[PDB]
Design a protein around this motif. Sequence first.
Motif, PDB file in Angstrom:
ATOM      1  N   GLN A   1       2.214   6.534  -6.962  1.00 19.63           N
ATOM      2  CA  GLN A   1       1.160   7.210  -7.728  1.00 19.63           C
ATOM      3  C   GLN A   1       1.287   8.721  -7.597  1.00 19.63           C
ATOM      4  O   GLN A   1       1.153   9.460  -8.561  1.00 19.63           O
ATOM      5  CB  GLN A   1      -0.223   6.731  -7.301  1.00 19.63           C
ATOM      6  N   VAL A   2       1.478   9.184  -6.350  1.00 17.98           N
ATOM      7  CA  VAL A   2       1.534  10.635  -6.127  1.00 17.98           C
ATOM      8  C   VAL A   2       2.769  11.248  -6.802  1.00 17.98           C
ATOM      9  O   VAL A   2       2.668  12.306  -7.417  1.00 17.98           O
ATOM     10  CB  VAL A   2       1.485  10.901  -4.602  1.00 17.98           C
TER      11      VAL A   2
ATOM     12  N   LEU B   1       0.871   4.032  -3.015  1.00 19.82           N
ATOM     13  CA  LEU B   1       0.415   5.411  -2.772  1.00 19.82           C
ATOM     14  C   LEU B   1       1.498   6.395  -3.177  1.00 19.82           C
ATOM     15  O   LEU B   1       1.261   7.407  -3.825  1.00 19.82           O
ATOM     16  CB  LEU B   1       0.067   5.636  -1.339  1.00 19.82           C
ATOM     17  N   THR B   2       2.730   6.124  -2.710  1.00 21.19           N
ATOM     18  CA  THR B   2       3.828   7.072  -2.902  1.00 21.19           C
ATOM     19  C   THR B   2       4.176   7.142  -4.407  1.00 21.19           C
ATOM     20  O   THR B   2       4.340   8.250  -4.949  1.00 21.19           O
ATOM     21  CB  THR B   2       5.040   6.697  -2.052  1.00 21.19           C
TER      22      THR B   2
ATOM     23  N   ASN C   1       0.818  -1.210   0.000  1.00 24.59           N
ATOM     24  CA  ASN C   1       0.000   0.000   0.000  1.00 24.59           C
ATOM     25  C   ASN C   1       0.853   1.262   0.000  1.00 24.59           C
ATOM     26  O   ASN C   1       0.649   2.161  -0.811  1.00 24.59           O
ATOM     27  CB  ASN C   1      -0.943  -0.023   1.200  1.00 24.59           C
ATOM     28  N   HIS C   2       1.804   1.353   0.929  1.00 20.91           N
ATOM     29  CA  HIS C   2       2.576   2.583   0.982  1.00 20.91           C
ATOM     30  C   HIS C   2       3.391   2.813  -0.265  1.00 20.91           C
ATOM     31  O   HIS C   2       3.539   3.950  -0.710  1.00 20.91           O
ATOM     32  CB  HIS C   2       3.459   2.634   2.234  1.00 20.91           C
TER      33      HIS C   2
END
Lengths: 224, 224
Positions: free
Chosen positions: A160-161, A157-158, A153-154
């Motif tokens: 993608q951003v 998320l990172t 997950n982390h």
Amino acid sequence: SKRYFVTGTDTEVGKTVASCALLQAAKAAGYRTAGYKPVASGSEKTPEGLRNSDALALQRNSSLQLDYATVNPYTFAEPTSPHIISAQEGRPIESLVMSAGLRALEQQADWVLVEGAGGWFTPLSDTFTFADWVTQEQLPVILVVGVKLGCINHAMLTAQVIQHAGLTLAGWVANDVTPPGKRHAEYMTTLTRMIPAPLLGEIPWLAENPENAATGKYINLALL
Amino acid sequence: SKRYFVTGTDTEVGKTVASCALLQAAKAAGYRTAGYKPVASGSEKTPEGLRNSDALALQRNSSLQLDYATVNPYTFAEPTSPHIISAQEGRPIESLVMSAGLRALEQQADWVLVEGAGGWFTPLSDTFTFADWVTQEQLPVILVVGVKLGCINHAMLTAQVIQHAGLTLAGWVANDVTPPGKRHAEYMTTLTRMIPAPLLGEIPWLAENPENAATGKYINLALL
């Protein structure tokens, strides 16, 4: 020449361990290297002023003999978000100063690794984050992924951003933050499929690497 | 009626504690409530089959008397990513089954809280993540933020990605995962400014809340 920004998926993934491995690999390849940590919080007193342990590691792992302030111009004692301790100390953090320090290292180094002061969205003031500065500088980003529960997950998320900011996700480093577990291979496969950047290498679990054994060997800079 | 998906910033932010507080507050407001955890990993054997502790908490905090499988139709023993243990067990996770279970709770409940099986991008298969399913269902999302180092970055990453999916960030809950620290107020101010959703309430540090004292009182559902 080359410049990279290194960020971690979470707290205590050994981001600076990975930065040091990258710097070591770059020196082995023949670069004149420098680490840069413009902002640091959580620092110890010395006769010369405050010194941050991560900035010291980057200094020591630079192939150039660099003065501390060149590696880390903003040093705060307390280990808390830069915007908070900056405001408490009355010591504002200025983008232009951060950028000038990067330029100054480029006077001597042809391979510069930049580390932040927390994760991607670390506030530097109430209106400016470390992501803002990285974006302005258009730095390619290397993600350090601690292989532990929650890492998929982390990492996603990172990643993608960073891509949404228009930045290149140049590579990722797997850091083995615990002893081997059961699902290690399957987690590595999953991370490898999902992170849209080359896996540069995997650093073994070094129980904090008290002897400072060399980690550059774990990084394949040709993949970067 | 009402439906919400609850997600946490990281591992061990007490996401299920917050879910239980939300459910308690909804019951106090007069809703017929149900918790739903379609997928669970890390479960104990019983004579009736495997039971996951977070799903049991959601079951116990539902105002309706619900059968376990209605709360949690997919239960895996081992505490590892659903896609991994699903593949190992030969028990595929199907979106349509997850959706059917949500519909089934809507036969009886007018307020349904849905929890995942890890963070936002938790894989369910090698090609489908829990984010995919939430997006399909167009659920409004409540973010649970553990107030600890790294929380600002993780909250911002997670909020940005939810909004980019086209979803509503309906609210956030602050969970005090440690005893009070020094920068608590300043961290709360920062999170409050930066998270683009109403703060619904803050749950105190309950040292794991062994007596099951009521937490609904910390949530203001009118803010949701």
